[PDB]
Amino acid sequence: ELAPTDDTYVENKSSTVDSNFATSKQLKFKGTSKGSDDRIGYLKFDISNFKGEIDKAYIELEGKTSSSSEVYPPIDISIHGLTDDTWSETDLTWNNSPNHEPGSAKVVGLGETATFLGKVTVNFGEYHKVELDITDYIKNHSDNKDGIVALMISDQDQNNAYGWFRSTQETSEDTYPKLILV
Ligand SMILES: [Ca+2]
C-alpha cells in the first residue's frame, strides 16, 4: 500500500494557469467542450523499495463529482501512465505540465509518452472508492523500470462535469490515493 510522493492538479483559467495546487486536499478534474476551466490531476509513486516480483498492481482513488445545480450521471475519468516523471508536485502548473494540449485536457503522446490505463467511473455527491488494475503497465512497461511511476487523471471526453479525488493533504490517510502492489 503506497501513498503518492507527489500529488497535485493544474487548472486552465487565466488567473490560475501559472498556479501550483500541491497544498490542496483536492485533485480536481474537469473536461469542457472548449478546454477553458479544465483541470488535470497528477500522481507520482516510488516503487523502487518494493521487495520481490510484482504480481498484481492497482491504483485506488477516493472521489466524487459535485454541482449545486444538477445531478451528474456517472462520469468516466481517464488514467494515463506517463513517461515524464521529471516533475515534482510543487513544479506543475497548467502552463508547465506534461501530456496535454495547451488549451485543454486533450492528451498528447498517446501510445508514446502517455499510456492509456483505463477509466474509473466517478459518481455524484458522495465520496466513494474507485480502483483500476494496472498490473501490465507496472510489471512490464518501460516507464516503470526506473521505479518512479507517474499517472495523469483527466476527463478526455468533454463531459463538462466537475469533481475531484482526495489528495495526500487530507487529514485521514485512508482517503489518499493508493498504489497497491501484490
Ligand atoms: Ca518512470
Residue numbers in the entry: -2 to 179
Task: Please quote the paper that reports this structure.
In the present work, we identified a new CBM domain in Dp0100, which exhibits a strong affinity to alginate, and this added another functional domain to this multidomain alginate lyase. Phylogenetic analysis supports that TM6-N4 constitutes the founding member of a new CBM family denoted as CBM96.
Structure determination showed that this protein domain is a monomer and an overall architecture of β-sandwich fold. TM6-N4 exhibited an overall β-sandwich fold architecture with two antiparallel β-sheets. Examination of the bond lengths, coordination chemistry, and the nature of the ligands led to the assignment of the peak as Ca2+. The metal ion is coordinated by the carboxyl oxygens of Asp82 and Asp142, the main-chain carboxyl oxygens of Asp140 and Ile145, and two water molecules (W7 and W11). A broad and shallow groove is positioned within a loop region of the β-sheets. Using the crystal structure as input, an overall positively charged electrostatic binding groove was generated at pH 6. These results indicated that the amino acids located in the bottom or the wall of the shallow groove, including Lys10, Lys22, Lys25, Lys27, Lys31, Arg36, and Tyr159, are essential for alginate binding. The single mutation of R36E can cause complete abortion of alginate-binding ability, indicating Arg36 plays a central role in alginate recognition, whereas most of the other mutants were retarded to the top of the gel. Moreover, the lowest Kd values were obtained with G6 (0.02 μM) and M6 (0.06 μM) substrates, indicating that TM6-N4 probably forms the most stable complexes with hexasaccharide.
